[PDB]
Design a protein around this ligand. Structure first.
Ligand SMILES: Cc1cc2nc3c(=O)[nH]c(=O)nc-3n(C[C@H](O)[C@H](O)[C@H](O)CO)c2cc1C
Ligand SMILES: Cc1cc2nc3c(=O)[nH]c(=O)nc-3n(C[C@H](O)[C@H](O)[C@H](O)CO)c2cc1C
Ligand SMILES: Cc1cc2nc3c(=O)[nH]c(=O)nc-3n(C[C@H](O)[C@H](O)[C@H](O)CO)c2cc1C
Lengths: 258, 258, 258
């Protein structure tokens, strides 16, 4: 909102709209975890920690008054800067329909990669545990389409034993999916009309349940673009966000090793 | 309109309608680029240039007043003539339902070939750059249906990385499509219910996005038929048009080499 | 409009009004061609070329499909910068009625000189042909008031033979008019109550007709003042415009040589 000093940048509304549209287009396809995790609505720019519902006891055994500290997850704030050229942006008012925005595109891709890295592999300094850390939810698979179908059937059996019943989704590496091409319809049938999501963020596959409420992404402020300063031929802008992540029910996740 | 001297030709309304219907039928199937590019509506017979939104600076460094010229694309005007025989046309009033129009058909085919040549391979004297000139948007493919499916999957991955997400279309040579016959349904599935367009204008394939606004055909006057003169047994007519073409976003185009 | 980043300059409305009024006052007296040419209303900041209504043919003689390019005049864009001092401008709010604006005045004079140079002597890189280039519309004159009156009578005879009949205007050099002082009323009578315009842009005289539609100045954006940047004690502003010029009917112009 107002903390993004957007009205102090030497840009018109058309130029701001151009920048926003390009960034939104790239984020929509490059944010992969949001395709299957839950998003807990924005809390605001002042939100700092998310409760864990637990107390850690710090007093001795014999004290009359006993006390401890409540536990929480601190939010992560990120900021990434880039520069844009003013003459090239001003050609848009002369009527050019294809203005150069390569710096914006590269920075957007790096920010998306950072967020997906946190979701899939966690952050030790922050206390986040990623999806690929739950090593006890792992089964072995072969390298043939028959093996993939058998693995999916076994995974559904394990879900049934645990009591998890919703739509099911397969998340798989692109290079591995290329070898399994030709069985897409059969894979969908064995998943009971579920989704397949190909991604370069992982090396193997995994199967998840999308009934709702098992993986949470907590947002304070969603991804935003703001203004820093101006340096003699160009404007410096930044992308900012604040978030954290947690896995509530590990039983809704199975790793495939192959 | 009135600049086509149509009311001065010795023809009746029925004969004019016959000629127009035949030409329209042939154009509708032989104009291939219009099957997947955008058409920017007619501007009129007086339109001359299309702006590029850019200035070229022509003054020295030390001048107090600095100046340059705006840049634009000039439109191309084409005219092709043919002759028709008056007695054979007059049999239509006696009641003949199949009058000979072979000269009209041949001229229509040549005009369509000219326009498609400009769209696919450009015009150096005019400043148009064709689709097959963007050589950096190229990936390699094999000569088996499995290879075609793999190439299409990789192309969709590249589109996803660039942020381009719309319906996808495959444009392929007819002789090459004959070898890939038998996998049409599978190709459609890998394209996510996209279109296939076979054409003899290219030697390989290409994949495009049809979200809208990436390839523009600018028309001043659409294809029209008019009257020139009369020579002793026949009427001389002509086909005319004025147009230009530009590729706005090269990221919505991938060339397949095989 | 908004492409002039005026709202980002550290100036108040009173200071902007002061600057605008001074510039307008100087332009109104120093733009000489606008005193007798027609002005074709503003088309906008995106206008790039003006049609000439002509085709240049570029194909061979034997081709079935023949083609060419439409012709036009590209517009000229000019920008000139100057600096103003912030403390001296801020005295205006303390109540000073005579603030120093000498840089603005000098830049305005140079811009007006540039535009008049284009109107009177053309621009070869742009394709503009100036008034003094039409050398076939020339008659000889002496250096006495009787000679001037005789020359004007002969010029009106030539206009009558060509069919041009409107109000007539004499455009003459100031130093030469000083020698012809004393016959102003007689010159007006021989012109039939026409105007006299003295100017330092030419060395001899010329006579024109002001019936309308013979000399055209095409404007995209009229003369405007905008903001560039700020450098530590001062603001950098600029004057910008985009225009072109053409002589439609050379028969409404006669050059006097003396
Ligand atoms: C004809 C012309 C047009 C220009 N237009 C722009 C413009 O739209 N935006 C811009 O930032 N600079 C523009 N410049 C350059 C601008 O003056 C630049 O910031 C200079 O370095 C300032 O002294 C233009 C320069 C010329 C000669
Ligand atoms: C019975 C008959 C019918 C004709 N009908 C036509 C006709 O409908 N249209 C035409 O152009 N010429 C027609 N012609 C030929 C026409 O007279 C031709 O232009 C002659 O060469 C003119 O002297 C016809 C000739 C004959 C004998
Ligand atoms: C009494 C006083 C009044 C001033 N007023 C102005 C002013 O109205 N505008 C201005 O630009 N500078 C003004 N200055 C100078 C201003 O502080 C200058 O930019 C300094 O160099 C900033 O450190 C003023 C200085 C003094 C001592």
């Amino acid at each position: 909102m107002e903390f993004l000093k957007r009205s102090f940048a030497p840009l018109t509304e058309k130029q701001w709209q151009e920048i926003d549209n390009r960034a939104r287009e790239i984020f929509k396809t490059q944010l992969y975890g949001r395709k299957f995790v839950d998003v807990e609505g924005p809390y605001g720019w002042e939100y700092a920690a998310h409760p864990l519902g637990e107390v850690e006891v710090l007093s001795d055994e014999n004290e009359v008054v006993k006390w401890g500290l409540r536990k929480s997850l601190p939010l992560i704030e990120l900021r990434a800067t880039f520069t844009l050229d003013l003459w090239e942006l001003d050609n848009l008012e002369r009527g050019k329909p294809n203005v150069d925005l390569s710096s914006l595109e590269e920075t957007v891709r790096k920010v998306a990669e950072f967020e997906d890295e946190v979701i899939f592999r966690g952050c030790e300094k922050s206390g986040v545990k990623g999806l690929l850390s739950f090593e006890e939810r792992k089964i072995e698979c072969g390298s043939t389409p028959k093996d993939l179908l058998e693995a999916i059937v076994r995974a559904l059996s394990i879900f049934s034993k645990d009591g998890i019943e919703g739509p099911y989704t397969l998340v798989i590496n692109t290079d591995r999916w290329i070898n399994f091409l030709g069985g897409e319809k059969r894979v969908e049938e064995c998943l009971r009309g579920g989704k397949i999501i190909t991604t370069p963020r992982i090396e193997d596959a995994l199967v998840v349940s999308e009934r709702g409420g098992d993986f949470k992404l907590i947002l304070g402020q969603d991804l935003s673009i703001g203004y820093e300063d101006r340096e003699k031929d160009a404007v410096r802008l930044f992308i900012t966000e604040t978030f954290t992540f947690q896995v509530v029910n590990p039983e809704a996740l199975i790793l495939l090793k192959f």
